[PDB]
Structure formats: structure tokens, C-alpha cells
């Protein structure tokens, strides 16, 4: 259980607006999340997430999210990106951030009067996959391989970030990455822990585009997706 925290995602805003009772619950399942991290169709979840608890589809704006950029950046800027993991749902695994560099695709996710179809959500997901922001694009960032992967498998890739080993004696799992205090970020179930990295934004301008967060489990078949509205100017 988790969701994107910085920049503030649609899911974070849905919870802060008093709409989403369990932001960390928005999940794509059942799916094959491992070891091939991008083969599973994203279905209704799409690149922004769907929360079944309250029937909230984050792929379209409402009065509470999606209307404008939450934060503005510069092309090529190295930025802080953070997600929030629940204390009781820390799965380990691998996660990433993506930006679709096709504005006309993204526009269909910026219209409060339009709900993307599942085919449009998948075409968008494919554009996000193409627009993955690699861990390794940030000078000096350590980009390791997963303790839950072996070379030759489709999870053996350090463009994606990895959580710490599930079985590590010190600082295991995703919480171990920052080793932050409980409730350093909000979750509804048991309180949240931050998971913080940097990415290099693309050399691309938009007054309003999306960054999509994706987190895949290894032990169970589950994917968590969120997106944030940003500007790159
Ligand atoms: O308004 C929110 C919040 O802002 C500040 O705190 C931010 C953040 O601080 C801490 O996260 C740390 C990580 O723990 C630490 O590991 C490090 O992550 C680095 C890595 O070291 C690098 O290798 C590379 O990948 O980049 C990441 C990200 O820079 O630094 C981050 C902070 O950037 C803390 O654990 C989190 O809980 C915090 O959100 C203010 O201090 C805070 O008061 C305020 O609440
Ligand atoms: C953003 O909008 C302003 C109009 O307010 C315009 O001048 C500028 O070119 C736009 N930027 C992009 C990246 O489209
Ligand atoms: Zn979970
Ligand atoms: Zn479940
Ligand atoms: Zn694949
Ligand atoms: Zn286009």
C-alpha cells in the first residue's frame, strides 16, 4: 500500500480534499507484477490509478484534482520525488517515475468532461513506459539491482529504483530506503513512511503534463500507480 507524495499526486489531493478515505489502497490487481515489470495491462487503473474503495478514477480531473499543475519545474531539472508506504503494507519491490512526452495523449487525462477508456489508458501507459525517468540519469545517485531478482530476469534493470531487501536485518523493504519516522507522510491504515529519490526531468516543455509513479511488488501480484500534474517551463 502506497501512493505518490511529492510532487503532490492526484491521489494525495483526493485524500487532502476529504474524498479518498484510503489513498494508499488504490491498487492494480490481480496482475503479474514480477519479474516483467511492464507486461501486465494497466486496465482501469491506467497511469493515474483507480481506487476501488470509493470508486475514484484519478485518470480524469475533478474539482479536487487535475485542474492545474501542482508544481512547476525547468527542463532537465533534477527534482525530488517521494512516495508514501503504509507501515502494514511495505512490500519491498521496485518503483519508477515516468513522463509521457506526447502532449495530445496526455491531454485526454486533463479534461474534467472526459473519462479515458481502458484502451486510451493503455496507449498512455505505453507512452509513459517510453518516457521512464531512469535512476541513473541523476549524477551520483546509487542505482542498485533488486535483492528479489537475478541476472537474466526482466526485473534486472537499474532504470527503475529498488526498495531494500525484504529480508535485510537492518533497514529492510521500502521503509528502509529513507528510514524515516512513522507518519512522515499520511496513510489511512497504519501510518506512512516516506520513500525519497531524485529524477532528472526530460528536456521538454509543457504548461500542464503528468508524472506517473509505478510500484511493483515481487512476492504478490500487485501494482500501485499515481500521477501528479506538473509544469515544465
Ligand atoms: O515538506 C515535507 C518535508 O520536507 C523536508 O523533509 C524532506 C524529507 O527528508 C527526508 O528524506 C530524505 C531521505 O531520508 C534521505 O535518504 C535523502 O534521500 C536522498 C538520497 O540520499 C540520495 O541518494 C538521492 O537518491 O536523493 C534522495 C532525495 O534527495 O534525502 C531525503 C530528503 O531529500 C525524510 O526521510 C523524509 O521523511 C522527508 O519528507 C523537511 O525537513 C520536513 O520537515 C518536511 O516535512
Ligand atoms: C504556457 O502558456 C503561456 C500562455 O500563458 C505561453 O506563453 C507559453 O508558451 C506556454 N508554454 C508552453 C510550454 O506551452
Ligand atoms: Zn499493499
Ligand atoms: Zn487486495
Ligand atoms: Zn516487459
Ligand atoms: Zn501528439
Residue 230, SS3 per DSSP: strand
CB atoms within 10 A of CB 29: 15
Q: Which atom of ligand 1 is nearest to the CA of 184?
A: 37
Cα–Cα distance measured from residue 137 to residue 2, given in angstroms and rounded to the nearest whole number: 24
CA atoms within 13 A on the CB side of 86: 15
Domain ranges for the chain, please list them. Answer: 2-233
Residues 150, 154: Cα–Cα separation, whole Å: 9
- Give the integer Cα–Cα distance in Å for 29 and 175: 22
Q: Which of 76, 86, 87, 13 is nearest to 49 (CA)?
A: 13
Alpha-carbon distance of 71 to 58, in angstroms, equals 18
Task: Name the residue with the closest Cα to ligand 2, atom 1.
Answer: 207
Q: What whole-number distance in Å separates Cα of residue 124 and Cα of residue 63?
A: 23
Residue 86's φ and ψ, nearest 5 degrees, are: -70, 145
Mutate to test the pocket of ligand 1, among 136, 158, 178 (most ligand atoms within 8 A of CB): 178
Residues in the chain: 233
**Torsions phi, psi of 20, nearest 5?**
-100, 110
DSSP class of residue 164 equals P
Rounded Cα gap, residues 13 and 26, in angstroms: 13
Resolution of the experimentally solved model in angstroms: 1.6
Amino acid at each position: 500500500h502506497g501512493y505518490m507524495y511529492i510532487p503532490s499526486s492526484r491521489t494525495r489531493l483526493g485524500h487532502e480534499a476529504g474524498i479518498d478515505s484510503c489513498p494508499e489502497c488504490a491498487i492494480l490487481e490481480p496482475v503479474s507484477s514480477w519479474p516483467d515489470l511492464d507486461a501486465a495491462p494497466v486496465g482501469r487503473s491506467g497511469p493515474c490509478g483507480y481506487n476501488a474503495r470509493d470508486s475514484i478514477d484519478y485518470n480524469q480531473p475533478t474539482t479536487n484534482w487535475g485542474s492545474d499543475a501542482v508544481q512547476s519545474y525547468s527542463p532537465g531539472e533534477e527534482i525530488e520525488v517521494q512516495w508514501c508506504v503504509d507501515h502494514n503494507g511495505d512490500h519491498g519491490g521496485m518503483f519508477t517515475y515516468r513522463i509521457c512526452q506526447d502532449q495530445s495523449i496526455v491531454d485526454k487525462f486533463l479534461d474534467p468532461s472526459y473519462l479515458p477508456t481502458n484502451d486510451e489508458k493503455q496507449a498512455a501507459e505505453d507512452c509513459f513506459d517510453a518516457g521512464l525517468l531512469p535512476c541513473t540519469d541523476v549524477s551520483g545517485q546509487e542505482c542498485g539491482y533488486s535483492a528479489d531478482c537475478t541476472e537474466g530476469e526482466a526485473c534486472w534493470r537499474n532504470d527503475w529504483f529498488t526498495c531494500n531487501g525484504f529480508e535485510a536485518s537492518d533497514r529492510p523493504k521500502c521503509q528502509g530506503v529513507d528510514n524515516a519516522e512513522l507518519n512522515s507522510c499520511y496513510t489511512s491504515i497504519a501510518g506512512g513512511y516516506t520513500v525519497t529519490k531524485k529524477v532528472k526531468l526530460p528536456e521538454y516543455t509543457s504548461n500542464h503534463t503528468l508524472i506517473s509513479f509505478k510500484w511493483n511488488s515481487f512476492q504478490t501480484g500487485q501494482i500501485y500507480l499515481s500521477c501528479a500534474d506538473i509544469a515544465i517551463q
